[PDB]
A = this chain, B = another copy of it.
Amino acid sequence: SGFRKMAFPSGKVEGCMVQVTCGTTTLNGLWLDDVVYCPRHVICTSEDMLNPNYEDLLIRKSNHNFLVQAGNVQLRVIGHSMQNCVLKLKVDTANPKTPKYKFVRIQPGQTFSVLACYNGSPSGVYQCAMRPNFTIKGSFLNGSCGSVGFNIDYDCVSFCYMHHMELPTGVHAGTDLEGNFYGPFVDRQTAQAAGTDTTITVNVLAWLYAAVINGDRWFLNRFTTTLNDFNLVAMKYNYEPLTQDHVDILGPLSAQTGIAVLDMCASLKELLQNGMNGRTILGSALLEDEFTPFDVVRQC
């Protein structure tokens, strides 16, 4: 029993973290086979950041302007190209530590692990979700750009996030591994606004099912609800709408616990109305939205 915000083992990713220096800028890169991936704003100066033109800064770069250091080794760059907001550095060594991997673009509410690195050096791993506003609530100091986020599935790594910047509100924005941002952000130091964040409803339901699986039922009630009546209440608490897809996705947890999805939805409406009255659910005094149905099944 017990329930933790549990990350994936970071070792397959630890072996791909390199350092990439351009001019006076240093960030982290991701070494797979003979391609090093990193965010393109490593080619930027302090005057650039308001309105850089990256095609024009890259054309001015030769292979040997890119200091790539894999731990002790200095990798020789034999080629550079750009794909959206990620720079791809070709090098003369395939990375022997290269795992089985895929690049995947996730949908908001998906969870993944983050390997925070500074100077190509892993500092720590943690779990988080893509917020519905395509932001992530991370732990990121200056210099963490290039840290990646991932899932592992039977020794195959699914890379899904590269870290590019911190927003004024304190949260973080980034891109998939084909360099396309999540959300409406750009790699530019101009005014940029995180959208209105909202609770991931289908995740909170999953977390409540986990709490039942672990043996607490104190929050259940004798009521049910319609999908539409539930959503009309949830939205007044800034919760994400629940769709039929979500309900289908929860089917396995409902079958395991014998609580209908729409009955679990009724519990949530009452939780939102009453609060928790001095109690806790799986050690949280707030309702927890960073666990997906897959997560709950994996851990339980």
Interface residues of A (CB under 8 A from B): 1-12, 14-15, 115-116, 122-126, 128, 137-141, 166, 170-172, 214-215, 280, 283-286, 299-300
Contacts of A4 in B (CB 8 A): 126, 128, 138-139
Q: Is the CB of A125 within 8 A of B171?
A: no
Smallest CB gap from A122: residue in B: B9
Cβ-closest 10 pairs across A and B: A11-B11, A285-B285, A6-B124, A9-B122, A11-B14, A1-B170, A4-B139, A4-B126, A2-B139, A9-B10
* 8 further interface pairs, Cβ-Cβ under 8 Å (given A2-B137, A2-B172, A141-B300): A1-B166, A9-B10, A9-B14, A9-B115, A139-B299, A170-B214, A283-B286, A285-B286
**Of B125, B128, B171, B299, the contact of A8 (CB 8 Å cutoff):** B125
**Of B5, B10, B214, B283, the contact of A10 (CB 8 Å cutoff):** B10
Smallest CB–CB gap between A153 and chain B, Å? 12
Smallest CB gap from A125: residue in B: B7
Q: How many copies does the complex hold?
A: 2
Smallest CB–CB gap between A163 and chain B, Å? 11
Contacts of A6 in B (CB 8 A): 116, 123-126, 139
Sample 6 A-B pairs with CB under 8 A, ordered by A number.
A1-B139, A1-B141, A3-B139, A4-B139, A9-B122, A11-B15
The complex places the Cα of A140 from the Cα of B2 at a distance, in Å, of: 6
With A2-B137, A137-B2 already in contact, the answer to whether A126 and B285 are too (CB < 8 A) is: no
Q: Is the CB of A126 within 8 A of B170?
A: no
Q: Is the CB of B125 within 8 A of A5?
A: no
Contacts of A285 in B (CB 8 A): 284-286
The complex places the Cα of A123 from the Cα of B138 at a distance, in Å, of: 22
**Of B11, B15, B166, B299, the contact of A124 (CB 8 Å cutoff):** B299
